[PDB]
Design a protein around this nucleic acid. Structure first.
Length: 56
DNA sequence: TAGGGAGTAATCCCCTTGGCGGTTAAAACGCGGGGGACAGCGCGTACGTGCGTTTAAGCGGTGCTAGAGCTTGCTACGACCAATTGAGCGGCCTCGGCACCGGGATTCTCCA
């Protein structure tokens, strides 16, 4: 059994920390631990990156 | 303090919608002609209008008594529930009613 640690990429931690900011109001925690598990898997699960352009 | 509710996502059965293909039967298209729609016409009779008659509907009034509408008293009966079972539902089976076919017989139409 080999443990393989890797840190949250800058996009993931932008998701994770703004999500964790909800703990300043709630604590829904069982909802948050599923959103935290999504971003810990891939942020496209939480918000799919897609072709984008400036504000019109 | 603990139990069971709230949240959520994976798991897997059920089932309704949609497409493909053919093919085949019914809808679409054409056209002749017929006969039924419909306009135009004549008559006559049947219905609206008017006037004098009558008839009885409607309003004001009197008297009566039935019976609608309310109060009281009580017990009968249907709501209620715990215990018992058998009537009636869901699943499975099969055979016989009925349909669908084919071909020969009787009916009905339409033109002569």
């Amino acid at each position: 059994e080999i443990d393989v640690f890797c840190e949250l990429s800058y996009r993931q931690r932008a998701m994770y920390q703004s999500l964790r900011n909800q703990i300043s109001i709630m604590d829904t925690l069982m909802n948050l631990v599923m959103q935290f598990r999504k971003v810990c898997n891939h942020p496209d699960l939480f918000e799919r990156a897609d072709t984008s352009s400036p504000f019109f």
